[PDB]
Amino acid sequence: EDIDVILKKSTILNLDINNDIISDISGFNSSVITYPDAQLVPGINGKAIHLVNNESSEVIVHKAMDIEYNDMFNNFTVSFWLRVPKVSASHLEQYGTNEYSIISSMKKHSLSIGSGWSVSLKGNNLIWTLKDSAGEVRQITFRDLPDKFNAYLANKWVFITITNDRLSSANLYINGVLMGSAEITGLGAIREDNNITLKLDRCNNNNQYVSIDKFRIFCKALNPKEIEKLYTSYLSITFLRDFWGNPLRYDTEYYLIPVASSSKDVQLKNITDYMYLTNAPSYTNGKLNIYYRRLYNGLKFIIKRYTPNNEIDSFVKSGDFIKLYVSYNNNEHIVGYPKDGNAFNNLDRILRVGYNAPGIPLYKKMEAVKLRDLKTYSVQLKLYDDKNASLGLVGTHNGQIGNDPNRDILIASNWYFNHLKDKILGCDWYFVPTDEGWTND
């Protein structure tokens, strides 16, 4: 049949946030109970659930009568976006073996045996657990990547999907890709609690927290294709996103990192002058098998709205016109290109920060857009002159300026418009805001 129709018809539970209220929009009307300390924060598409480590921070879904998907060997899929802060070297050492659940249908410490299923975390491992009425259990243990810059449990919003085929295996997907599997054949009937609990259970780290979004459940095992579509259907483009996957915002400091070479930071030659790439330093921990380029080094940029267009939205929308500034010494300096400004072969125009030569027009009208790579939280910036003609997308060009050493200098070029289909490009940028979910060790 039709994939979109299948995804829709197979849904028996779909949590959505509207008017700051959490509820089931699947159509089955399951009751949703939000506790006092269950917080709401920016999400992949609207707001998301944020859970802290105390008993007041939880969300309970009491299943409607008709919603029975874990019947006698009935296939089912659970999906939701997830965001877990990067685990510090210390905490990894201190709480590494502490496995705690965050989502579960298992009623614990009571009359029934270990009920249905659970999603738990243990160090840098994501775990899916299935337990039947007899107490038999099956598990999928996913070990995150060593390089936290590209890891799935390192402060970025990632899409999780776990499919369960009672005649074969349980499969764990992340951003639409298979990351783990486990045969579940031989398992008997699952008799879970009529309650689906979103809460940190048995977590020894008082500072631990997580964010969960679009929690959904299907009454069938979605296939790769259906999962791919589900995943991408959430990638709306109304708003642009920062490095963590949250809505891009105005009047906010962001470090820029070129997607094409995530190893570089941005530096400024001098006020009124040009910008260029630098080698960011890395953190490495052999015994913990964890490493990553450090963040928060290099220039700090701020996005300001070009003009107020009836309504002031704190979020930057794709297509919004803006003015880019860099914060240097408690002062904000406009980024742009002055008329007749030095440029590589008259095509790659070298950007200037705080250029102020009297009598010389300085072009600064930029447009923040999302022109490619919808799965990555990157952004493109387009520069225009006073005649609203395109001076090109922002990127870099290797060369020299006077006696300075060879560098990858920040430029604006229209040349990128003829390669918008490449895997990697050069005009793609990550906007990185300081975040408590990531601190360099």
Ligand X SMILES: N[C@@H](Cc1ccc(O)cc1)C(=O)N[C@@H](CCC(=O)O)C(=O)N[C@@H](Cc1c[nH]c2ccccc12)C(=O)O
Binding mask 223-242 for ligand X (x = CB under 6 A): --------------------
Task: Pick the closer one to ligand X by CB: 347 or 360.
Answer: 360
From the list 122, 269, 317, 372, which residue makes contact with ligand X (rule: CB under 6 A)?
Answer: 269
Shortest CB 182 distance to ligand X, Å: 58
Shortest CB 150 distance to ligand X, Å: 34
Q: Which two tokens stand for residue 265?
A: 């930071």
Nearest to 119 by CA among 100, 132, 135, 137: 100
397 burial type by CB count under 10 A (0-12 exposed, 13-18 middle, 19+ buried): buried
Which residues within the stretch 151-210 sit at the binding site for ligand X (CB under 6 A)? none
User: How many whole angstroms separate alpha carbon 194 and alpha carbon 30?
Assistant: 10
Shortest CB 267 distance to ligand X, Å: 13
Shortest CB 341 distance to ligand X, Å: 4
User: How many whole angstroms separate alpha carbon 19 and alpha carbon 127?
Assistant: 32
Shortest CB 324 distance to ligand X, Å: 16
Shortest CB 321 distance to ligand X, Å: 23
Binding mask 335-364 for ligand X (x = CB under 6 A): ---x-xxx-------x-x----x--x----
Task: Pick the closer one to ligand X by CB: 50 or 352.
Answer: 352
Q: Is 402 in the site for ligand X (CB under 6 A)?
A: yes
Q: How far is CA 269 from the centre of its chain?
A: 32
SS3 content of the chain, % helix, strand, coil (to 5): 5, 45, 50
Number of residues that bind ligand X (CB under 6 A): 14
Shortest CB 260 distance to ligand X, Å: 23
User: How many whole angstroms separate alpha carbon 167 and alpha carbon 277?
Assistant: 53
Task: Pick the closer one to ligand X by CB: 262 or 342.
Answer: 342
Q: In the beta sheet, which residues pair with residue 305?
A: 322
SS3 at position 5: helix
Shortest CB 400 distance to ligand X, Å: 10
Shortest CB 408 distance to ligand X, Å: 14
Q: In the beta sheet, which residues pair with residue 147?
A: 291
Task: Pick the closer one to ligand X by CB: 185 or 400.
Answer: 400
Q: Is 385 in the site for ligand X (CB under 6 A)?
A: no
From the list 274, 301, 325, 363, which residue makes contact with ligand X (rule: CB under 6 A)?
Answer: 274
Task: Pick the closer one to ligand X by CB: 339 or 375.
Answer: 339
Q: Is 401 in the site for ligand X (CB under 6 A)?
A: yes
Other beta carbons less than 10 A from residue 134's beta carbon = 12
Other beta carbons less than 10 A from residue 121's beta carbon = 23
**Stretch touching ligand X by CB under 6 A, among 204-212, 226-234, 363-371, 396-404:** 396-404
Residues 6+ apart with CB under 8 A from 172: 126, 128, 140, 142, 160, 161, 162, 178, 179, 180, 181
Q: Is 254 in the site for ligand X (CB under 6 A)?
A: no
Task: Pick the closer one to ligand X by CB: 186 or 402.
Answer: 402
Cα–Cα distances in angstroms (integers) from residue 268 to residues 143, 184, 299, 312, 335, in the given order: 39, 56, 7, 31, 11
Task: Pick the closer one to ligand X by CB: 360 or 374.
Answer: 360
User: How many whole angstroms separate alpha carbon 393 and alpha carbon 379?
Assistant: 11
Q: Which residues bind ligand X (CB under 6 A)?
A: 269, 273-274, 338, 340-342, 350, 352, 357, 360, 401-402, 404
